[PDB]
Amino acid sequence: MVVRSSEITPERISNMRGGKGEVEMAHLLSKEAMHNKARLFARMKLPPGSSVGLHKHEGEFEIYYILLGEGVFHDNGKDVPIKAGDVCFTDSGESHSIENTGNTDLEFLAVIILL
Amino acid sequence: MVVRSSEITPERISNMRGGKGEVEMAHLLSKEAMHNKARLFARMKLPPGSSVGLHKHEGEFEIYYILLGEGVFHDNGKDVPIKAGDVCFTDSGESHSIENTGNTDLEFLAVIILL
Ligand SMILES: O=C([O-])C(=O)[O-]
Ligand SMILES: O=C([O-])C(=O)[O-]
Ligand SMILES: [Mn+2]
Ligand SMILES: [Mn+2]
């Protein structure tokens, strides 16, 4: 199958994981589609000023691929500035967050893979 | 960890899986780092006229997320026009290919998840 991102209605989430402002999440493939091996495959849009709040992953890991804009990725107690083209990897047992510190939308892909 | 795409030296590959022309692949995360749950997380670049040739996947599935450009994704005997923002899903037992039928570069993420 092909899924045209452009044509998936995002869910608007306020204070996602305790973050700032409103964020949009477009689910691109279901976990069932992904044979229960990954539980999330989504495109996130963070308006200027918004963030996904600090939260922990256990028994899984998450990858962000930054698609557009700029911001700051927090992982293992460190802030790292990120931009389009960056991969952010969060391992099992770590906590992370991400904030849009620029003036255009920060978009990225998020994939959570089990165990 | 953060991995900055632009700073990875791609591997140049001619006639990838029997395709046309020469493509570039940047491996972004190793299988090890992904706990042996995925065997590939790469950013591919196809110049116009180039393709990843037809090939079969077994015991795993693969996702392309299109980054830039346009082209044609072949799956289950059908040619499907794709463009930036599209997700291409190839399930286990299926065969796929992708060709840059456009006039600029076609870039995409490829992830192969096991079982
Ligand atoms: O949903 C999550 O875990 C995320 O987006 O980081
Ligand atoms: O090598 C593969 O499986 C691919 O890139 O589609
Ligand atoms: Mn997370
Ligand atoms: Mn393939």
Side-chain angles (χ1 to χ4, degrees), chain A residues 1-77 79-115, chain B:
Chain A
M1 66 195 90
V2 177
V3 175
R4 183 148 293 169
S5 254
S6 336
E7 300 176 342
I8 296 271
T9 305
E11 71 177 313
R12 173 204 87 185
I13 303 160
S14 57
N15 310 116
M16 187 181 188
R17 306 323 271 261
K20 313 191 281 178
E22 290 179 359
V23 130
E24 291 206 313
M25 184 191 283
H27 310 253
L28 304 182
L29 297 164
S30 75
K31 159 184 166 171
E32 283 211 25
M34 294 182 292
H35 302 248
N36 305 304
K37 295 292 187 189
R39 82 169 175 76
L40 186 69
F41 191 97
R43 192 185 176 163
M44 303 293 306
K45 184 169 102 180
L46 271 55
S50 68
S51 72
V52 179
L54 185 72
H55 59 291
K56 184 174 179 183
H57 287 281
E58 33 192 328
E60 63 200 10
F61 64 89
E62 203 167 359
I63 306 159
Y64 298 162
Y65 185 93
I66 311 308
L67 301 168
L68 290 158
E70 275 170 9
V72 182
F73 179 64
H74 183 95
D75 174 285
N76 193 51
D79 298 322
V80 168
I82 48 79
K83 58 181 208 185
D86 290 347
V87 173
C88 310
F89 186 73
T90 296
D91 213 340
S92 183
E94 308 189 318
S95 302
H96 69 181
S97 62
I98 182 160
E99 190 173 336
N100 184 359
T101 54
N103 301 280
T104 51
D105 296 336
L106 168 64
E107 312 204 18
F108 55 97
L109 231 57
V111 194
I112 299 172
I113 296 184
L114 301 184
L115 311 202
Chain B
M1 64 174 39
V2 170
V3 174
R4 176 151 297 173
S5 269
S6 68
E7 296 181 355
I8 290 166
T9 301
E11 66 175 315
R12 272 153 202 197
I13 301 169
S14 316
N15 308 113
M16 185 179 200
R17 312 307 291 259
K20 303 184 283 203
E22 154 175 310
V23 307
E24 280 180 4
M25 174 183 292
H27 300 265
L28 300 176
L29 289 165
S30 64
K31 179 172 177 192
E32 260 195 63
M34 300 188 283
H35 298 256
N36 300 311
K37 292 305 195 176
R39 76 170 183 78
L40 183 71
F41 195 81
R43 182 181 174 178
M44 305 290 314
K45 185 263 263 177
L46 274 56
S50 66
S51 77
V52 181
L54 184 69
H55 62 280
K56 178 162 187 210
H57 285 278
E58 265 288 9
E60 63 198 11
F61 62 95
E62 185 166 15
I63 299 162
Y64 297 159
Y65 182 83
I66 311 312
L67 302 167
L68 306 168
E70 58 178 18
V72 172
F73 174 65
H74 182 95
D75 180 81
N76 186 42
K78 291 166 152 200
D79 292 315
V80 179
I82 50 79
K83 63 181 208 179
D86 293 349
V87 173
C88 303
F89 184 82
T90 287
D91 213 348
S92 185
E94 297 176 348
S95 296
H96 70 170
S97 61
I98 183 164
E99 183 168 340
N100 184 2
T101 53
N103 71 118
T104 50
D105 291 332
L106 175 60
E107 301 191 9
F108 62 97
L109 258 31
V111 64
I112 303 175
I113 295 172
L114 303 180
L115 287 259

